[PDB]
Every structure is written in C-alpha cells, then in structure tokens.
C-alpha cells in the first residue's frame, strides 16, 4: 500500500541523460550578485603611478597614506607624465610596489646641500600649476648657476635600519644649442657606484618629432639600497638629483568605479563558493572561473 514519496517543485535541471529535467531543489554553484563597487587600497582619482611617485603638480592630495594593499587606477590617466619619457624597467617597479606594507617619505638630502648649483629656474611648461610653470617637487633639475658646473660628488651612508628607494634621471637635449647653454660641457656623462651595480650613461642628441609641446624626453631609473651600505654619485652635467627617498620595510587593478578578500575591476566578490561566470581576471584571490551559465545539483526530502 505504501509507495514512493511524491513531491512538488518549480525548477529545472540538466544532465547527460536528457536535455532538461525538473528538479526538487535547485542548488546552484555560481552567483553573479556582485556589488559593483570597491587595509584600504589606495584610491587615486586621475594621477598616474609614475606621476604620483615623481610628484606631479596635481598630486598634492596624496602621498600621506599610512598603508595600502593594492593600487586602483583607470586606463589612460590624464595626469600622466607631462614631459614625454619613460621609466626603464617600468613593469618591475609596478611589480615591486604591489605590496609595500607601510610607506614613509623621508628627506635624505636637504635642499641646502647644493650651494654651488642653482635650483630656482628649473620648471617645465608642459604641466603648469596654479597658472604658473612648475616642475616635479620630488626631484631637482640642476641647471648652470654661474656659467660653470662643478662636479657633483655627494654620498650617503644609510645609517637607518630599513631599505631605502632612490630615483634619479638623465635629460636628453633637443639639439646642440640646448646642450650648449644649459650645461657648460659639450659632452657629459653620469656615474653610479654601489656594491652590486655599475652604471655609465651619455646624453643622446638627435632631431625628433613634436609629440607634446617640447621635443625633449625624460629617462628615469631606480635602485634598491641595502640597510648597511653606502651609495655614490658622479656627474658632469644633465644630472637630476633626488630630494626625498622612501623608507620601506619588506615585501594591480586597472579600471575605475565608485567605492571581502576577492576583488575584480568591476566589483567586489562577496562569496568564495566554488566559481562563477563573472570576469575571470581578479586580484588577490578568486574561487574559480567557468564559461557557462547553469550548474545545479539537488538534495533534500
């Protein structure tokens, strides 16, 4: 008299045995209920990474940050390097700057340490500020002071107990006349000396097209300094000297949207359940990616 239990439901499931079968309980595997919004990661509006590090004039609202976990930046920033140029090993810097723990800015070299060289008239009109020509506030464009250029032989000892990050640049003149009046030496070179790095460079003079305002170009480098080691500098022109260094202790999302361990450039993932069909490209952690729409299993009663 007793028979198999019969129940009711309003859902469907798929399998190999058929094309579509009704299911008593539709328990899914994926979800698409992403918020669509974002330690607190850095939230910059338009400043580029290179512009922020070099101190672009429109970045006065930043830098003073205790700690960040990852960088939020949109494609094609309008606050990029006003002066054309690029950074050698640029991708390496981004990879290193992914995890930084805390980030403290400290002036290793005071401004008064350059008595024989001039500083006031180093500005660029490419990225002016408050209606006046200006320049990056993290570096100094040393220029001829008294129609002479004494050799720079500064040095540092790094008496602290943490790693320091330094930056310096080399300027490429547009032609011979620019090199003639800005610097006394027709031929110049720079020299960098440390424990495990030797560097020698020379300016490059050649005609070039007009990309953005002036036709010159910038070249920037970076290095890592050991806690108990010294560094040395030597140059005879076209040198860019740093004013501030960044103190770090130890060891990227590209989109833009309004403000969990899983984050994607479109939203914040609030679940770690097996996977989902949402954007596979994530940062940090992601359950998994599947190119499908329906994955269901049933249980109960």
């Amino acid at each position: 008299c007793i028979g198999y239990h019969a129940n009711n439901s309003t859902e469907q499931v798929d399998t190999i045995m058929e094309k579509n079968v009704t299911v008593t309980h539709a328990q899914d595997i994926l979800e698409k209920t992403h918020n669509g919004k974002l330690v607190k990661p850095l939230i910059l509006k338009d400043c580029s990474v290179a512009g922020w590090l070099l101190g672009n004039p429109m970045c006065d609202e930043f830098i003073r940050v205790p700690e960040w976990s990852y960088i939020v930046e949109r494609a094609n920033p309008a606050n990029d390097l006003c002066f054309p140029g690029s950074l050698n090993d640029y991708e390496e810097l981004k990879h290193m700057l992914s995890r930084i723990n805390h980030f403290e800015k400290i002036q290793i070299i005071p401004k008064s340490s350059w008595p024989n060289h001039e500083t006031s008239l180093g500005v660029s009109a490419a990225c002016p500020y408050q209606g006046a020509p200006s320049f990056f506030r993290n570096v100094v464009w040393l220029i001829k002071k008294n129609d002479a250029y004494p050799t720079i032989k500064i040095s540092y000892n790094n008496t602290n107990r943490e790693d320091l990050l330094i930056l310096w640049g080399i300027h490429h003149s547009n032609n011979a006349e620019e090199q003639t009046n800005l610097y006394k030496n027709p031929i110049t070179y720079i020299s960098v000396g440390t424990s495990t790095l030797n560097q020698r460079l020379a300016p490059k003079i050649a005609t070039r097209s007009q990309v953005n305002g002036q036709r010159g170009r910038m070249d920037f480098f970076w290095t890592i300094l050991k806690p108990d080691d010294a560094i040395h500098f030597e140059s005879n022109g076209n040198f860019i000297a740093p004013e501030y260094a960044y103190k770090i202790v130890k060891k990227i999302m590209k989109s833009g949207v309004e403000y969990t361990k899983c984050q994607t450039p479109v939203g914040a993932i609030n679940s770690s359940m097996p996977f989902h069909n949402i954007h596979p490209l994530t940062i940090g952690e992601c359950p998994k990616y599947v190119k499908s729409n329906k994955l269901v299993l049933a249980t109960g009663l």
Partner: antibody
Amino acid sequence: VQLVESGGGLVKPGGSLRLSCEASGFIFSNAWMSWVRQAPGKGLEWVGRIKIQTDGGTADYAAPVKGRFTISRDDSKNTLYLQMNSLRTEDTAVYYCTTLYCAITTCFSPRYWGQGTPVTVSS
Amino acid sequence: ALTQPASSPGQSITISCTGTSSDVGSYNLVFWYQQHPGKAPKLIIYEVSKRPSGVSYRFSGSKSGNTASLKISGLQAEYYCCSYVGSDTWGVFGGGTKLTVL
C-alpha cells in the same frame, strides 16, 4: 608686480624706434611674456608671444605683422626689447605689455597689465 | 570674431557675449576684463564662476551653450572678453561694451 616700461613718441613713417620693459615683482625665468596693442574703437589685437629658454621656442609674430617686427629677450638683465621698422600710419595706437596665464599646454590670455605707451605715425 | 552687443543705481544688469563653436564651447577657458576711462585693463573674472581674491562682490556670472552672461549687482555712480581657441597661437579678442549710468 610693478613692471616699468620705457620709450615712446612720434616718428616719421618708415622709420625706426625701440621700446623696453622691466619688472621686479617676480622672478623672470619662469614668466611667459607677450605684447599686445590697443586701438581706438576696435580694441585689443595680438602682436606675438615669447617662449622661455629652458623650453626652447621662438618668436611667432602675427600674420599682418610678420616680416617686420621682432622681439628679443634677456633674462640676465631683466629686459625685453621691441624692434619696429617700416611702420606706416595704421600703426598709430597704444601698446600694453603683459604676462599670460598658463593652461594645459600653452598660455592663452594676459594676467597683469601695464599702463601702456602711445605710439603715433603721421606726416 | 567674438561679437558683443553695443552700449540707474540700485538695479542689476547683465552683459552677454556671443561667439561660435570654433571659438567657444564646453571649455572653461573664457576670460572677462574691466576697463575704466584713462586706466589700464583689470581682471574681474578669469576662470568662470571662480571670482578671484582682492576683489569686491559686484561681479558674478555664468555660461551656457554658445553664450556666457556676466551679472553686475548693486550699481553705483562709479569691458572685453577672450575665449579658448585650441592649439592655435592665442585666444580671440571680442568687441567691448560700454555701460551707462544715469
């Protein structure tokens, strides 16, 4: 900003004369410089604009004034000169010198104005 | 070029400027100047609706579409504009307007 000018007066058509301008309220190595003319009835009219030595550049005169006028810059002594030659009767007007506001990539419009200088051409 | 219209205390008047799409637009780089008989030009409002320092409350205005309007308030007993042009050499000057007090 208390710029001081010099020169001016009456000259015969086709002659030559010079003006000069100086200032002391700001450093001169970071200031874009321009020179403008004010005429009765019509008003202002562009004459040219000068670059800065750090950024290269050259004096690009206006089309109606091209080929006769030139401007020289001397940041060492804080002096700007104007070279007028082959002038005619239509050049009679007052001229005002000024710096320019800096925006995006280049300067657009004046910021600080002098009190001017009248120049006349007549027979 | 950029054209302007031709020429009692306690009232409020508005002066407007008419340009063209090649000379005016959504850009914010439009100036306005004040002139007095026998005096030098002075800057009243350089960045639109960003009244400068060391000036009085008299001058205010806005911009919309192909024209911009400048409002003068509290007239007593006691004027040129320039617009953005692009990468071109310099901005275009416009005709002046004379105010009459009676």
